[PDB]
Design a protein around this ligand. Structure first.
Ligand SMILES: [C][C]1[C][C][C]N([C]C2=[C]N3=C([N]N(C4=[C][C]=[C]C([C@]5([C])[C][C][N]C(=O)[C]5)=[C]4)C3=O)C(C(F)(F)F)=[C]2)[C]1
Ligand code: NA
Ligand SMILES: [Zn+2]
Ligand SMILES: [Zn+2]
Length: 384
């Protein structure tokens, strides 16, 4: 349920973004200029919102823009994320100037979110004009899935997207579905846009085996490094400079939907290659046979990926989820947010799942099996 994105509403987001910029200009933070750089992203977001308002210049156009489903979600998401950043600095206090602190980590998570939100608004409203109903999903087979389940929709709730995906590619557990939500829902707004879908389907192509490619290359592959700057890629591989063929692959916030493979050359240098619009596992296979990519993260064992041409533990999914904003999500269903607290154990889940559990004669807490002495309605945030 979102309010209409009228001029007054869009303007509140700017004022909130202004506080986040003022907060992030403190020199005791020492933010590296490396992207995502919040001090550039927030003004660039204001500028695009301005460029959009310049196209919907009269009351007739503003009314059309206000009721745009994706735009209403965008403004509310931008506003909520902006308020979260202000709140993060308030509660964090001096922990915002300790680089290794969880409050700082949470700010890094938001910077990635604001960065993905900018690339999204720029792809959905290129030159300030709506083109979501004209967005071209890069892989035809992936596009055909979106068209079948979601028609011309630019964005659909994660709850809806997940059940439709399961119909084509089975999701085997709640934790696997939670890892999937953090991978695809990059803007952390509980919706999947056609842009986020295009990102995911380009990275883990081909569509035919998409979840096998994701489960292997991102959840369990030792060379997978999630988003990194080139500075972080070189610092990781630096310890293996004396081992030619050592490699890692990372996502890049300035090249969404593409992989960057960093590797050690025969002469000790750390270089990188951006693969074409082809499966990342094929570039790793060709690279291994040619002698360029042999040691993932400097490790001697290179997983045989040829199985992807012709099982993930719950713990592996849990570790993969750490960078995500899914703590507020019920782990049982991975589709409703946690809205109830068990007492005295304290485990949280959604009321729908607790009800399904009690109705199945499940003994005690679904998680720890301890007696439910009582329950309490609660609201959870990803950074709790
Ligand atoms: C660009 C660069 C800058 C500086 C920093 N670095 C490092 C990092 C990385 N990162 C992070 N986060 N992240 C993420 C988030 C969300 C989501 C995600 C996915 C997609 C899913 C889950 N998982 C995986 O792997 C992937 C991710 C990532 O990447 C961080 C923090 F802090 F925020 F946590 C850090 C980066
Ligand atoms: Na999203
Ligand atoms: Zn649930
Ligand atoms: Zn419990």
């Amino acid at each position: 349920k979102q309010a209409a994105a009228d001029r007054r509403t869009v303007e509140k987001t700017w004022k909130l973004m202004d506080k986040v910029v003022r907060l992030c200009q403190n020199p005791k933070l020492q933010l590296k200029n490396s992207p995502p750089y919040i001090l550039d992203i927030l003004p660039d977001t204001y500028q695009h919102l301005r460029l959009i308002l310049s196209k919907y210049d009269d009351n007739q156009k503003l009314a059309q823009l206000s009721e745009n489903e994706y735009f209403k979600i965008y403004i509310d998401s931008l506003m909520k994320k902006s308020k979260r950043a202000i709140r993060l600095f308030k509660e964090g206090k001096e922990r915002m100037y300790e680089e290794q602190s969880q409050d700082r980590r949470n700010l890094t998570k938001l910077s990635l979110i604001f960065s993905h939100m900018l690339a999204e608004i720029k792809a959905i409203f290129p030159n300030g004009q709506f083109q979501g109903d004209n967005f071209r999903i890069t892989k035809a087979d992936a596009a055909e899935f979106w068209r079948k389940f979601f028609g011309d929709k630019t964005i659909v709730p994660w709850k809806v997207f997940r059940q439709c995906l399961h119909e084509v590619h089975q999701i085997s557990s709640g934790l696997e579905a939670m890892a999937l939500k953090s991978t695809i829902d990059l803007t952390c707004n509980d919706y999947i846009s056609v842009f986020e879908f295009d990102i995911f389907t380009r990275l883990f192509q081909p569509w035919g085996s998409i979840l096998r490619n994701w489960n292997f290359l991102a959840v369990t592959h030792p060379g997978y490094m999630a988003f990194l700057t080139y500075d972080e890629v070189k610092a990781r591989l630096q310890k293996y400079s004396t081992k030619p063929g050592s490699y890692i692959f990372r996502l890049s916030c300035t090249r969404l939907g593409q992989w960057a493979i960093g590797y050690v050359t025969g002469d000790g240098n750390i270089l990188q290659t951006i693969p074409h619009n082809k499966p990342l596992f094929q570039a790793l296979i060709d690279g291994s046979r040619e002698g360029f990519y042999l040691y993932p993260d400097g490790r001697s064992y290179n997983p045989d990926l040829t199985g992807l041409c012709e099982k993930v533990t719950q713990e592996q999914y849990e570790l993969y989820c750490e960078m995500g904003s899914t703590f507020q999500l019920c782990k049982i269903c991975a589709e409703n947010d946690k809205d109830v607290k068990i007492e005295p154990c304290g485990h949280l889940m959604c009321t729908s799942c607790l009800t399904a559990w009690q109705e199945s004669d499940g003994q005690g807490c679904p998680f720890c099996r301890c007696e439910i002495k009582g329950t309490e309605p609660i609201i959870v945030d990803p950074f709790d």
